[PDB]
From a paper:
Here we report the X-ray crystallography structure of a T cell receptor, shared among unrelated individuals (public TCR) in complex with a dominant spike-derived CD8+ T cell epitope (YLQ peptide). We detail the molecular basis for the shared TCR gene usage observed in HLA-A*02:01+ individuals, providing an understanding of TCR recognition towards a SARS-CoV-2 epitope.
In order to gain a deeper understanding of the YLQ peptide recognition by CD8+ T cells, we first refolded and crystallised the HLA-A*02:01-YLQ complex and solved its structure at a high resolution. The YLQ peptide bound to the HLA-A*02:01 cleft via canonical primary anchors of small hydrophobic residues, P2-Leu and P9-Leu, characteristic of HLA-A*02:01, and an additional secondary anchor with P3-Gln. The side-chains were well defined in the electron density map; this is possibly due to the numerous intra-peptide contacts. The only exception was the P5-Arg for which the density was partly missing for the side-chain, showing high mobility. This rigidity was consistent with the high thermal stability observed for the HLA-A*02:01-YLQ complex. Indeed, the thermal stability of the HLA-A*02:01-YLQ complex was about 60 °C, which is similar to that observed for the dominant influenza-derived M158–66 peptide bound to HLA-A*02:01.
Numbering used by the authors:
A (entry chain B): 0 to 99
B (entry chain A): 1 to 274
C (entry chain C): 1 to 9
């Protein structure tokens, strides 16, 4: 069976500034089958209050989801998205970089 | 401008116990307005856009009824496809369905769609004329014979050309303050020195609606794709979209490079320079 | 507005 690995983008809803309330996103796309595990991390630890959009898919049938949580960026704090899927041997970790 | 109404349905079997997971989502352009999740408490078609909340109890009872009928049809479908493909009851399988209509700038029927995939691969699709079927294999051909004998395309064509267009038009009116508004990208450029010979210019497009956008880089007024990175358009989470295009450049030559931005909310394309 | 009829594969 066709097993497509997820594409991952970690980013903020608004351009980030230290001390200003924002939203941390993790966009997972191009994956198949639909079961996927996505966590947002604050200094390597799982953030508890994470919501996600309802499962949808693109023209090519591949699935996409947006995972998100409210956060206040700071200089020291490191944010990341941790993804696990049938196609991944180990969880994939993508760091949040304010410049992308 | 032009508009679309789309419904996306995913059904995933769960062999160990119980009925499949069923998620249905409705869109007008890039805006989700309704949802159904078999795992959620309500067991109702729910609003996801404030302009659909204007619809009264008749609407919600009708949509709930149809979405549960859609769910039971997909449940039977997963069982039918397992038989067509001679698969065991042990594995999890996915049926996906998408249907809807496109309307031109006149808000009149332009195109209709009604297609399926089984396990991520094309199964059966209604052709552009809305009169014939594209059946991928001999399992999909069994569906095609059944539907041809039962005149299924005629029934789908009537909804897609008539009903679909009429309700999209109503949704467009009720949601006119957002649905008929185009949000032009808020653009800016960033610079990042990688070494003393190389720099990265990043051209950002933010808070735009609809999602459709083109970002291109030019070097001395000529299109440049080499040494460029373009991320997939991504949702901001507030109903708008984001995208960036970066170019790797020789340090000190930044001025030769211009970013070109095309979007529905922009009457003429815009240019950005470092 | 969902399709009122459904057709089985």
């Amino acid at each position: 069976m066709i097993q497509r690995t997820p594409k991952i983008q970690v980013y903020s809803r608004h351009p980030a500034e230290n001390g200003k309330s924002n939203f941390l996103n993790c966009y997972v796309s191009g994956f198949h089958p639909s079961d996927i595990e996505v966590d947002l991390l604050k200094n390597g630890e799982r953030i508890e209050k994470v919501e996600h959009s309802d499962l949808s898919f693109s023209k090519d049938w591949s699935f996409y989801l947006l995972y998100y949580t409210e956060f206040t960026p700071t200089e020291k704090d490191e944010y990341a998205c941790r993804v696990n899927h049938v196609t991944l041997s180990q969880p994939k970790i993508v760091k949040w970089d304010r410049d992308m | 401008g032009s508009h679309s109404m789309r419904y996306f349905f995913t059904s995933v079997s769960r062999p160990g116990r119980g009925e499949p997971r069923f998620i249905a989502v409705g869109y007008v352009d890039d805006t989700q307005f309704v949802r159904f999740d078999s795992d959620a408490a309500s067991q109702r078609m729910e609003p996801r856009a404030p302009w659909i909340e204007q619809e009264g109890p008749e609407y919600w009872d009708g949509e709930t009824r149809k979405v549960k009928a859609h769910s039971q049809t997909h449940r039977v479908d997963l069982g039918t496809l397992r038989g067509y493909y001679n698969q065991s009851e042990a594995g999890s399988h996915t049926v996906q369905r998408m249907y809807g209509c496109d309307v031109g700038s006149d808000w009149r029927f332009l195109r209709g769609y009604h297609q399926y995939a089984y396990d991520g691969k094309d199964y059966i699709a209604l052709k552009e004329d809305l009169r014939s079927w594209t059946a991928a294999d001999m399992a999909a051909q069994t569906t095609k014979h059944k539907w041809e004998a039962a005149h299924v395309a005629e029934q789908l064509r009537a909804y897609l050309e008539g009903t679909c267009v009429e309700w999209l038009r109503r949704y467009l009116e009720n949601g006119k303050e957002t649905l008929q508004r185009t949000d032009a990208p808020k653009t800016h450029m960033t610079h990042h020195a990688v070494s003393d010979h190389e720099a990265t210019l990043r051209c950002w497009a933010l808070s735009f609606y609809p999602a459709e956008i083109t970002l291109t880089w030019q070097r001395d007024g000529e299109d440049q794709t080499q040494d460029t990175e373009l991320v997939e358009t991504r949702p901001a989470g507030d109903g708008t979209f984001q995208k960036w295009a970066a170019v790797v450049v020789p340090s000190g030559q930044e001025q030769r490079y211009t970013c070109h931005v095309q979007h529905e909310g922009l009457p003429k394309p815009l240019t950005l320079r470092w | 507005y969902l399709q009122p009829r459904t057709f089985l594969l």
